[PDB]
């Protein structure tokens, strides 16, 4: 049935998205902060996409890593074909939406993934951080403050709703994000930033002892 597919595929992928760890991304003074609950040391759910565009995901690792790789491919081919400052978070988000829609309608099984594409302004420039959430069907949503992906999103989203503060420093945004995520030590957290102050490459991981000091 046309109705059966849409209702059944939707349930199969929303299940697999709630059947995974939780990631949050939020805006703070220096850019955007990604905080994910990740036990492994080799498998990662946060990644650089382009100079100022970062990426977080929640679901089935092989698939959102497939999307991670595709997005990297896309961004670099554009940046070389035109220029670096022409690739924007908006284009990337749009490509992920088209691709997840095509997958959701044409492939056998829908990608049980949830994506968040983040963008900050260039160096010495002024502009608000942009967060986009792309869901398994191709839907794309523009978020002003924070995105929560995977697992049970309600309690984390509400805790962030009470604790969020614009222009919070890096340490406060880390405390808020870890607290709302609990609703975990350096051995179970994947933390990275899109630091708007870096000259070119904005993405920067915060691991080990530096992460220890921040939290």
């Amino acid at each position: 049935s046309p109705e059966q597919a849409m209702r059944e595929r939707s349930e199969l992928a929303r299940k697999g998205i709630a059947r995974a760890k939780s990631v949050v991304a939020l805006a703070y003074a220096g850019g955007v902060l990604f905080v994910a609950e990740n036990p492994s040391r080799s498998l990662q759910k946060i990644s650089e996409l382009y100079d100022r565009v970062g990426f977080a995901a929640a679901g089935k690792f092989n698939e959102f890593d497939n999307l991670r790789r595709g997005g990297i491919q896309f961004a670099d081919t554009r940046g070389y074909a035109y220029d670096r400052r022409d690739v924007t978070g908006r284009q990337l988000a749009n490509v992920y939406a088209q691709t997840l829609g095509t997958i959701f309608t044409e492939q056998a099984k829908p990608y049980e993934v949830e994506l968040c594409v983040a963008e900050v302004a260039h160096y010495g420039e002024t502009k608000r951080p942009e967060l986009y959430r792309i869901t398994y069907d191709g839907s794309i949503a523009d978020e002003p403050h924070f995105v929560v992906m995977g697992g049970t999103t309600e309690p984390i989203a509400n805790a962030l709703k009470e604790s969020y503060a614009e222009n919070a420093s890096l340490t406060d945004a880390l405390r808020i994000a870890v607290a709302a995520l609990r609703a975990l030590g350096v051995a179970s957290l994947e933390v990275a930033v899109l630091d708007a102050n870096r000259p070119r490459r904005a993405f920067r991981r915060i691991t080990g002892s530096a992460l220890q000091a921040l939290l």
Partner: peptide, 5 residues
């Protein structure tokens, strides 16, 4: 797929 503009 709830993406209708």
């Amino acid at each position: 797929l709830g993406q209708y503009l």
